[PDB]
């Protein structure tokens, strides 16, 4: 009954690696001793309940702290000047100077300035006082309590769901699309139309009077009569001021498009109409699959009979239903890939089409949110590929996938890997070559020789969307175009002015720097996909190790025989692709941050001139914008950014410490620990105190994991202070 009760081998392990491996295999429930599928699924269900409880506790904590210690009520009156407060600081290490510097935001105590946009979100959805935030926090706390009770309950004997119920795909998909997506989005549209539009128009609608107050003067009579245009009639005027009745309309569902002029955010009526329409579409979608009545579809039948003629895709999608519904790793990988794509989409769309009031002028929050969601998108994509590899090495059955669409991937994996290698090499060679050419040309005082390629195709797409400065005059940019004529009466009158207005991040102007950095991003994405795809496809075996599936997913090596077999397990292909994930998201965030900093400063010529060469990138972005951060504290004093400076150097330290684990490997440290063991055992007094687990150096995979974690954490903790502190100090 040692600590790794789930692993008898680790329990009998006498060294200190028992603790490490137990901790890191605690959640690998599939490989646990004496584990069954039904128990696995039930334990997963309970852990999901606990996780949801944690999420709602985190949200309730944010709300409570803003309500109690934040200046939400003061910020509501003057959103564009008052700095939002996250929470108070309690630190007995602070000096008087630190307390004075951190006293800010119109409060009498030290505080932290929120950079998450929660103030903007809550103000937009219609929170006006600390009481509303407190009651929301209480509701979320009660929800977390209920979820924890549910997680406890569903592990009970009489309340333990069965494996057939878990594997009921059709009912789950029907409900999680018609209710979880559809009805929830309908509920959000109802919340907007009942509470948010009235609050933006100067009406205090709360639980005590939402029953009495009508969302529309007409009521539901237009809805039941079919005269649904009455709800679009009388939209908000361009002279409207958010939160006040002056210039306010009566429409609840509109398609104006563009942006609200005062807040430079999308119309709440447009957002409500969006959610209503998409809820209708989701509710219709959720009746597809057969559940207990007769109508519907069978996913097994669909997949089985989807096979093209003459065996183009082999046997088609036969057996994919079985593999997907049997293997949880494939489902996890698909979910992670979809969620990573969605996270990239929200990151790309929040800045281009801001939805929350006054967020466009809050430059720190925009950069923080973009960097945050892009990093999480990268993490989710790497996880999706890693779990695909785990599925291949653990849950793939060639007998079931005899000549399947999935098996043909393994059939021509060599071609796939070689072509990924080719495209990666081409992009890298030519992007780096053009960059170095531009560097040398500017270095020799002759910038005229630069190879500057205009992103003609992206500019063409901008023109097709409605941009006019390029002069392409295609589709929506052409006044005569049939597309413009068709859309002229619904959304184009707002969209055209929004896109052509130069004060906005919607379809930013692009140039040779954008061309070059986009091709660098393509290089990085293709190389990350190369590493991950090769890991997934060679996880089962390789010419250097055809029996890799017997060893499994994460093993150290096969020894120095056959020339050396370092980093062969396809867990090491996660490890090696995490570096490229950090690289590509770093390039993306550098690009976003610099192109937005220059535009906020009204100095886009600096980006357009200096972004074409790496010296310009190093000088005008990092070196230039690093001054307010490093000057957070100096010999003469300290500012509110001293915390950010400390963290920049702390992330630097963690990143550098990761290199130790990544470079120096286990034998050196094992011999050193043997010497230390000798010294401890031979010294007097101290030899009375004796360990229980024999100290040993960290395992190979353990130290790869630790070094990668140090690398990643130093990466994020040294870039976040930069992107926040420089943006705060410049305020542009």
């Amino acid at each position: 009954t040692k600590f790794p009760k789930f692993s008898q081998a680790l329990a009998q392990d006498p060294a200190t690696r028992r603790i490490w491996y137990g901790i890191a295999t605690a959640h690998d429930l599939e490989s646990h001793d004496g584990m069954t599928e039904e128990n696995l699924y039930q334990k997963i269900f309970a852990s999901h309940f606990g996780h949801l409880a944690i999420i709602f506790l985190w949200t309730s904590g944010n709300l409570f702290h803003v309500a109690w210690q934040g200046n939400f009520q003061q910020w509501v009156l003057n959103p564009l000047k008052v700095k939002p407060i996250a929470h108070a600081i309690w630190d007995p290490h602070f000096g008087q100077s630190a307390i004075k510097a951190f006293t800010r935001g119109g409060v009498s105590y030290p505080v932290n300035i929120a950079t998450s946009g929660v103030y903007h979100w809550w103000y937009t959805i219609g929170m006006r006082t600390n009481e509303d935030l407190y009651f929301g926090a209480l509701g979320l706390l009660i929800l977390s309590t209920a979820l924890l009770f549910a997680g406890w309950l569903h592990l009970q004997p009489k309340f333990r769901p069965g494996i057939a119920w878990f594997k009921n795909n059709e009912s789950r998909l029907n409900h999680h699309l018609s209710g979880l997506f559809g009805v929830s989005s309908l509920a959000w549209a109802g919340h907007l139309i009942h509470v948010a539009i009235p609050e933006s128009r100067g009406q205090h609608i709360r639980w005590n009077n939402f029953t009495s107050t009508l969302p529309h003067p007409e009521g539901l009579t237009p809805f039941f009569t079919g005269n649904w245009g009455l709800y679009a009639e009388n939209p908000d005027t361009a002279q409207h001021i958010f939160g006040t009745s002056e210039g306010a309309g009566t429409a609840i569902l509109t398609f104006l498009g563009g942006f609200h002029p005062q807040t430079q955010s999308m119309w709440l009526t447009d957002i409500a109409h969006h959610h209503l329409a998409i809820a209708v579409v989701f509710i219709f979608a959720g009746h597809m699959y057969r559940t207990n009545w007769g109508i519907g579809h069978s996913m097994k039948e669909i997949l089985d009979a989807h096979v093209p003629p003459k065996g183009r895709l082999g046997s088609g999608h036969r057996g994919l239903f079985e593999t997907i519904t049997d293997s949880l790793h494939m489902q996890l990988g698909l979910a992670l890939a979809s969620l990573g794509v969605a996270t990239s989409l929200v990151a790309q769309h929040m800045y281009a089409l801001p939805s929350y009031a006054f967020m466009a002028k809050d430059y720190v929050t925009q950069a923080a949110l973009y960097t945050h969601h892009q990093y999480i998108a990268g993490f989710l994509m790497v996880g999706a590929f890693a779990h695909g590899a785990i599925f291949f090495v653990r849950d793939y059955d060639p007998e079931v996938n005899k000549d399947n669409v999935l098996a043909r991937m393994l059939q021509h994996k060599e071609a796939i890997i070689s072509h990924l290698s080719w495209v990666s090499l081409f992009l890298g060679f030519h992007t780096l070559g053009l960059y170095i050419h531009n560097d040398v040309c500017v270095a020799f005082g002759t910038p005229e020789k630069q190879i500057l390629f205009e992103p003609v195709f992206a500019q063409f797409i901008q023109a097709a969307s409605g941009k006019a400065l390029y002069g392409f005059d295609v589709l929506l940019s052409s006044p005569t175009s049939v597309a413009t004529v068709a859309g002229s009466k619904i959304w184009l009158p707002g969209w055209v002015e929004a896109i052509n207005s130069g004060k906005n991040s919607l379809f930013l102007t692009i140039g040779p720097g954008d061309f070059l950095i986009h091709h660098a991003i393509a290089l990085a994405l293709h190389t990350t996909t190369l590493i991950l795809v090769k890991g997934a496809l060679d996880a089962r075996g390789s010419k250097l190790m055809p029996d890799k599936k017997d060893f499994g997913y994460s093993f150290p090596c096969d020894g120095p025989g056959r020339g050396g077999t370092c980093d062969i397990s396809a867990w090491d292909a996660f490890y090696l692709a995490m570096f490229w994930m950090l690289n590509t998201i770093g390039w993306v965030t550098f690009y976003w941050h610099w192109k937005h900093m220059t535009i906020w400063g009204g100095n886009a010529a600096a980006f357009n001139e200096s972004s074409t060469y790496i010296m310009g990138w190093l000088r005008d972005y990092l070196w230039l914008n690093s001054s307010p951060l490093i000057n957070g504290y100096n010999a003469f004093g300290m500012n509110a950014q001293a915390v950010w400076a400390w963290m920049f150097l702390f992330g630097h330290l963690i990143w550098a410490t990761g290199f130790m684990f990544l470079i120096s490997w286990r034998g050196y440290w094992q011999e050193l620990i043997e010497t230390l063991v000798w010294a401890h055992e031979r010294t007097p007094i101290a030899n009375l105190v004796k360990w229980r687990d024999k100290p040993v150096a960290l395992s190979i995979v353990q130290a790869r994991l630790v070094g990668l974690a140090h690398f990643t954490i130093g990466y994020i903790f040294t870039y976040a202070p930069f992107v926040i502190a420089s943006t705060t100090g410049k305020f542009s």
Binding site: A46, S47, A53, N130, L138, L141, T145, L148, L155
Partner: peptide, 30 residues
């Protein structure tokens, strides 16, 4: 302005959540 009593009832609900979390953890362990 959030009141001391409001903070206290919120803390009580948090303690209830703590007890339920401990129970859920025990049931997950077994």
């Amino acid at each position: 302005m959030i009141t001391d009593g409001q903070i206290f009832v919120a803390l009580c609900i948090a303690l209830t959540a703590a007890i339920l979390a401990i129970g859920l953890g025990r049931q997950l362990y077994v």
